[PDB]
Amino acid sequence: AQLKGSKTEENLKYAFAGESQANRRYLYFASKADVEGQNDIAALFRSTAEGETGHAHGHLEYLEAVGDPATGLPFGTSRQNLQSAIAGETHEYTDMYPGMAKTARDEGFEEIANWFETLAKAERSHANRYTKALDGLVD
């Protein structure tokens, strides 16, 4: 059976997105529990988040057969991983975040539009720094 083109490929991508968001959400919830003084709850959110890291990385390992879910490019070696990170980052800073900022401004959300513009600049920095590292890579 060929994973490329299958429903199972799409399910792995969806589940990877879900596990990734679960870790982020659980760490955000841990920080809320921190401030409240709910240290036992915070520790449980953190421990569960480690589980979601293991799940997401297992999904990504299967996706090595088909490509990085963010870009379609192969991944595995540092050279490949940097090239994929660069392509994804370039999309975020040239297209995704500028477009989101425009939509937010048009809809009346000036603070959110400025946030998206801050993130476009931040992803441009990430893209350039990864490109510098790729040029310096000796493998």
Residues 57-86 that bind a copy of itself (CB under 8 A): 57-58, 60, 62, 68-70, 75-78, 81-82, 85
What does 117-138 look like in DSSP terms, one character per residue?
A: HHHHHHHHHHHHHHHHHHHH--
Instruction: Answer yes or no: are the C-beta atoms of 92 and 118 closer than 8 Å.
Output: no
For 123, the token pair is: 């992803």
SS3 68: coil
Give percent helix, percent strand, percent coil of the chain, each to the nearest 5: 80, 0, 20
Distance CA 11, CA 69 (A): 11
Q: How far is the CB of 94 from a copy of itself (least distance, A)?
A: 14
Site for Mn ion in 78-117 (CB under 5 A): none
| Residue 17 engages a copy of itself in binding (rule: CB under 8 A) | yes
Contact positions with Mn ion (CB under 5 A) in 23-82: 52, 55
Least CB distance to a copy of itself at residue 13 (A) = 9
123 is in an annotated binding site: yes
- Does residue 55 have a known ligand-binding role? yes
11 makes contact with a copy of itself (CB under 8 A): yes
Residue 54 or 72 having the CB closest to Mn ion: 54
Does residue 126 have a known ligand-binding role?
Answer: yes
- Positions 83 through 112 that interact with a copy of itself (CB under 8 A): 85, 88, 92, 96-97, 100, 103-104, 107-109, 112
Hey, what are 113's tokens?
């539009």
